[PDB]
Design an enzyme around this catalytic site. Sequence first.
Site, PDB file in Angstrom:
ATOM      1  N   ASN A  46     -85.152  -9.969 -13.440  1.00  0.00           N
ATOM      2  CA  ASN A  46     -84.314  -9.056 -12.448  1.00  0.00           C
ATOM      3  C   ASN A  46     -82.478  -8.205 -13.661  1.00  0.00           C
ATOM      4  O   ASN A  46     -81.803  -8.137 -12.901  1.00  0.00           O
ATOM      5  CB  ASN A  46     -83.078  -9.685 -11.302  1.00  0.00           C
ATOM      6  CG  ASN A  46     -85.067  -9.822 -10.429  1.00  0.00           C
ATOM      7  OD1 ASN A  46     -85.984  -9.207 -10.345  1.00  0.00           O
ATOM      8  ND2 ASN A  46     -84.692 -11.228 -10.148  1.00  0.00           N
ATOM      9  N   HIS A 132     -85.102  -7.917   3.269  1.00  0.00           N
ATOM     10  CA  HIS A 132     -85.339  -8.996   2.378  1.00  0.00           C
ATOM     11  C   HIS A 132     -85.407 -10.133   3.654  1.00  0.00           C
ATOM     12  O   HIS A 132     -85.368 -10.289   3.914  1.00  0.00           O
ATOM     13  CB  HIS A 132     -84.383  -9.646   1.585  1.00  0.00           C
ATOM     14  CG  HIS A 132     -84.537 -10.606   0.494  1.00  0.00           C
ATOM     15  ND1 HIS A 132     -83.560 -11.252   0.582  1.00  0.00           N
ATOM     16  CD2 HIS A 132     -85.358 -10.374  -0.510  1.00  0.00           C
ATOM     17  CE1 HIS A 132     -84.263 -12.197  -0.473  1.00  0.00           C
ATOM     18  NE2 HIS A 132     -84.899 -11.259  -1.054  1.00  0.00           N
ATOM     19  N   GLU A 174     -81.286  -1.545   2.576  1.00  0.00           N
ATOM     20  CA  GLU A 174     -81.847  -2.236   1.428  1.00  0.00           C
ATOM     21  C   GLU A 174     -81.487  -0.812   0.487  1.00  0.00           C
ATOM     22  O   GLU A 174     -82.241   0.102   0.659  1.00  0.00           O
ATOM     23  CB  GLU A 174     -83.249  -2.652   0.307  1.00  0.00           C
ATOM     24  CG  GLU A 174     -83.164  -4.161   1.275  1.00  0.00           C
ATOM     25  CD  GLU A 174     -84.092  -4.725   0.729  1.00  0.00           C
ATOM     26  OE1 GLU A 174     -84.122  -4.467  -0.040  1.00  0.00           O
ATOM     27  OE2 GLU A 174     -85.350  -5.903   1.451  1.00  0.00           O
ATOM     28  N   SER A 178     -86.556  -3.811  -2.490  1.00  0.00           N
ATOM     29  CA  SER A 178     -87.871  -5.086  -3.252  1.00  0.00           C
ATOM     30  C   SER A 178     -88.491  -4.719  -4.203  1.00  0.00           C
ATOM     31  O   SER A 178     -89.444  -5.075  -4.927  1.00  0.00           O
ATOM     32  CB  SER A 178     -87.115  -6.082  -3.131  1.00  0.00           C
ATOM     33  OG  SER A 178     -85.854  -6.442  -2.925  1.00  0.00           O
ATOM     34  N   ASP A 203     -77.665  -3.701   1.914  1.00  0.00           N
ATOM     35  CA  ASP A 203     -78.123  -4.466   1.194  1.00  0.00           C
ATOM     36  C   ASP A 203     -78.324  -4.413  -0.402  1.00  0.00           C
ATOM     37  O   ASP A 203     -79.658  -3.556  -0.100  1.00  0.00           O
ATOM     38  CB  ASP A 203     -79.179  -5.501   1.127  1.00  0.00           C
ATOM     39  CG  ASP A 203     -79.676  -6.659   0.089  1.00  0.00           C
ATOM     40  OD1 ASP A 203     -79.454  -6.784  -0.967  1.00  0.00           O
ATOM     41  OD2 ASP A 203     -80.701  -7.935   0.618  1.00  0.00           O
ATOM     42  N   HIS A 206     -80.484  -4.298  -5.733  1.00  0.00           N
ATOM     43  CA  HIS A 206     -81.424  -3.675  -6.373  1.00  0.00           C
ATOM     44  C   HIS A 206     -80.712  -2.408  -7.122  1.00  0.00           C
ATOM     45  O   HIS A 206     -81.047  -2.344  -8.246  1.00  0.00           O
ATOM     46  CB  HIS A 206     -82.684  -3.654  -6.260  1.00  0.00           C
ATOM     47  CG  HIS A 206     -83.386  -4.419  -5.954  1.00  0.00           C
ATOM     48  ND1 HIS A 206     -83.784  -5.764  -7.342  1.00  0.00           N
ATOM     49  CD2 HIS A 206     -83.908  -5.445  -5.002  1.00  0.00           C
ATOM     50  CE1 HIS A 206     -84.230  -7.098  -6.290  1.00  0.00           C
ATOM     51  NE2 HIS A 206     -84.204  -6.787  -5.064  1.00  0.00           N
ATOM     52  N   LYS A 235     -78.534 -10.139 -10.515  1.00  0.00           N
ATOM     53  CA  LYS A 235     -79.981  -8.889 -11.287  1.00  0.00           C
ATOM     54  C   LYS A 235     -79.063  -8.075 -11.817  1.00  0.00           C
ATOM     55  O   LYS A 235     -78.926  -8.648 -12.960  1.00  0.00           O
ATOM     56  CB  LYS A 235     -80.222  -8.070  -9.739  1.00  0.00           C
ATOM     57  CG  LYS A 235     -81.518  -8.948  -9.058  1.00  0.00           C
ATOM     58  CD  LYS A 235     -81.537  -9.421  -8.079  1.00  0.00           C
ATOM     59  CE  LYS A 235     -82.505  -9.853  -7.076  1.00  0.00           C
ATOM     60  NZ  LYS A 235     -82.388 -10.350  -5.386  1.00  0.00           N
TER      61      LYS A 235
END
Length: 383
Positions: A46, A132, A174, A178, A203, A206, A235
């Site tokens: 990541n 997540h 998110e 993910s 969240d 990423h 990440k």
Amino acid sequence: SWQEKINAALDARGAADALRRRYPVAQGAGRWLVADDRQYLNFSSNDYLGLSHHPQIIRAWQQGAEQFGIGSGGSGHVSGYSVVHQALEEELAEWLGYSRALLFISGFAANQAVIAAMMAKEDRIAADRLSHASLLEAASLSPSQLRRFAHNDVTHLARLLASPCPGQQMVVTEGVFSMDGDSAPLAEIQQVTQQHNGWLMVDDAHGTGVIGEQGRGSCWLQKVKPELLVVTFGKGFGVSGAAVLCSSTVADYLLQFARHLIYSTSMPPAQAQALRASLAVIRSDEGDARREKLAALITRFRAGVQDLPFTLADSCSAIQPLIVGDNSRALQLAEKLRQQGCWVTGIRPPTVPAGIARLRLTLTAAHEMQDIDRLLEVLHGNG
Ligand SMILES: *Cc1c(COP(=O)(O)O)cnc(C)c1O
């Protein structure tokens, strides 16, 4: 008995195939992976901007130990709130456009802390079905009611929110998901959340550091400010840790009621200095150069798959699913890649449904174009 409870559980996991086994590596972050002393191109980490090995971050981590020793000595509510923690929080809030930031030792802890602190039995969480596990686990344990909306379906979200609720409603999603690396429709989600007087929690694990001006992430890029923004640094940032971004009063609240915050040792101040260093790289011209190089590698990758017997995701990020279909073909492929010096991870049922097995590839700004070309060559055939 206990042991039979243990045993049977491991047996059910086996029968569903679902057994997990860690492999030790000498190096696991960035362009290379070293296992069993062999070097491999690393398409499983990541470390999206290649910062784990960045010399400025390494030096901040090293000097911070000289200046502050290692452990903080306590919780942030006793002697563990370092001037370095405070500076890092202030720089994160300023960066992302919030009043306050609060540091956490992991993103999993921050997510779980926010929900545990904010959600009461009368309340409702409306969460993307693909959120997540930390979010869903926490939302599940919560006394509050948990409803899931179909992935990115804002029509479905509006119906959940519209249902009578005895208390308050928190929407959770998110910024970049993910599994498939796709983005959420944050502006439409925020509109219907506000329509129903809810608050929004995003969240952006990423997204953070990797997209938007100065790498500010998904919310900034989409010109949305959720009430709660969670960013994690394991990440793109190339370190470990997390922050919750929020208003002054929500920050005061979390400082009173989030037990991860009150009763947990703060991170080593030298970790905090490396995070400040990482943030400074991310916001800099070099940060822009790294994000553009990542975008170039993704373009090169997606173009090369156009000629291949596979299919891509709707992803413009470092997460690049290569859909294969069948679980045996997916496993074969990953094993062939490994023999050929390319370390990849296959994702198969049951984690994903029946005929959608895949390699979940991750690219990073530490990679080079010839690395993408090597991956593409092996996907094609040669050995
Ligand atoms: C990795 C992940 C986290 C967990 O953060 P850690 O700092 O690794 O505990 C939270 N959310 C999402 C979307 C992630 O992928």
